[PDB]
Amino acid sequence: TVCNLRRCQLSCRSLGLLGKCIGVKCECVKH
């Protein structure tokens, strides 16, 4: 349906960095 940003974010956060949901694809990015 969509992409759970909060979920995607927290997902990346696992690594320690931050996550972002762009369109329908989330990725782990550093601040």
Swiss-Prot record:
Pfam families membership: Toxin_2 (PF00451)
GO terms for MF: ion channel inhibitor activity; potassium channel regulator activity; toxin activity
Protein name listed in UniProt: Potassium channel toxin alpha-KTx 5.2
Role according to the record: Blocker for the small conductance calcium-activated potassium channels. Shows similar affinities for KCa2.2/KCNN2 (Kd=22 nM) and KCa2.3/KCNN3 (Kd=25 nM).
Keyword list, A-Z: Calcium-activated potassium channel impairing toxin, Disulfide bond, Ion channel impairing toxin, Neurotoxin, Potassium channel impairing toxin, Secreted, Toxin
Phenotype when changing R7M: 35-fold and 2-fold increase in potency of inhibition of KCa2.2/KCNN2 and KCa2.3/KCNN3, respectively
Site for Interacts with KCa2.2/KCNN2 and KCa2.3/KCNN3, residues: T1, V2, R7, V24
UniProt keyword Transcription, yes or no: no
